[PDB]
Amino acid sequence: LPAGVDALVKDGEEVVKGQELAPGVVSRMDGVALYRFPRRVRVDYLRKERAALRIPLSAWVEKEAYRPGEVLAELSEPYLFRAEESGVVELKDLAEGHLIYLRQEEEVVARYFLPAGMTPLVVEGEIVEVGQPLAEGKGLLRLPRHMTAKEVEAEEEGDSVHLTLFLEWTEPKDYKVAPHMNVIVPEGAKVQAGEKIVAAIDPEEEVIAEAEGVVHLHEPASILVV
Amino acid sequence: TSDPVRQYLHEIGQVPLLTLEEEIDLARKVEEGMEAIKKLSEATGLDQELIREVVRAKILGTARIQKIPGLKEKPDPKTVEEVDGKLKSLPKELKRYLHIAREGEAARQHLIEANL
């Protein structure tokens, strides 16, 4: 396998004669393919947040759990999403979506979620006020494609309805392995937080899990099918 | 006319060399195996070289290693098999160091052959 090329088939999987194991690698024998010295190791980290969004009920589509890419509400006219609290802001762009952390002094006041299509009207470090405009939906506004949603919380006192969500998603990360390094956990292995993904000669060069998630192996130096 | 030297030359010619990666991996697997034997020595209360050779008995061939050391070295059913059974009584954390050990043992052979 040429340096800087990934594998089409994941480690420890059945393969057939003629099947491509890579753009340049075609298997001549049916068997079980195995990675040899992966040049790159990716990881997926789990991110939990409990986040609130207020949207008019004449818009909102009734759903218990929205999923990646799943269409969120409607919003006839470009409804401005106005802050229910006062604080500083933390503008966190998650893929196509956004997150606003209303913070006072040390601890945050509240945390609000912006679906794709609801654009931030503020900038991180700026101050908001009670009822002050935070974001603006253009209508549409579906939940992003890398993120999921669980535990619907619906509170409606009127035309507008406040929705608290338990929002969890997967943030990607990449580690470039060296010859010093030796990969430990297998492909698609569910890993804990702080665990050592890939060892090495001196621990300074090692790979320590930054959070709880799953590990992936890529760019094998070679692929041995037996 | 059946040269003894070309035999060995083409015999070592079958196993390719080793770059930095393969070499480091080998050595590391070896030391890992040996230290594994060091812990396994505290496991059943045995020696280093004892369990170390017991591993060989199960790897580089079974009956053949204990069969012809010469007329007397060590008994196969007595001082060997009991070592196999005695180390079979151990849980996960322990029993895995065995596989680590034998793995390192193979790595040693691969290392010697690669640099031949």
Secondary structure: elements and pairs:
The structure is cut from a larger assembly and holds chains A (226 residues) and B (116 residues).
Chain A: E1 13-15, E2 31-56, E3 80-82, E4 91-94, E5 97-103, E6 108-114, E7 118-120, E8 133-137, E9 147-156, E10 160-176, E11 182-183, E12 190-191, E13 196-199, E14 207-208, E15 213-225
Chain B: H1 4-12, H2 20-44, H3 48-57, H4 63-67, H5 81-86, H6 92-114
Report on the structure:
The structure is cut from a larger assembly and holds chains A (226 residues) and B (116 residues). With 226 residues, chain A is mainly beta. In chain A, 0% of the residues lie in helices and 48% in strands. Chain A is built from no helices and 15 strands. Chain A has strands at residues 13-15, 31-56, 80-82, 91-94, 97-103, 108-114, 118-120, 133-137, 147-156, 160-176, 182-183, 190-191, 196-199, 207-208, 213-225. In chain A, the strands form 4 sheets. In chain A, strands 1, 2, 9, 10, 12 and 15 form a 6-stranded antiparallel beta sheet that branches. Chain A has a 3-stranded antiparallel beta sheet with strand order 3-8-7, with no helix packed on it. In chain A, a hairpin with a 2-residue loop joins strand 4 and strand 5 (97-103). Chain A is elongated. Chain B is an all-alpha fold and 116 residues long. Chain B has one domain: Four Helix Bundle (Hemerythrin (Met), subunit A) (Up-down Bundle), CATH 1.20.120.1810. Helix content of chain B is 67%, strand content 0%. In chain B, helix 2 packs antiparallel against helix 6. The longest helix of chain B has 25 residues, at 20-44. Chain B is flat and about 50 Å long. The two termini of chain B are 25 Å apart. The chains are: A mainly beta (226), B mainly alpha (116). The A-B interface holds A 37, 179-180, 182, 201, 221 and B 20-22, 24-25, 28. It is classed as transcription/dna/rna. Keywords: protein-DNA complex, Bacterial transcription initiation complex, transcription-dna-rna complex. Crystal structure of T. aquaticus transcription initiation complex containing bubble promoter and RNA. Chain A: DNA-directed RNA polymerase subunit beta'. Organism of A: Thermus aquaticus.
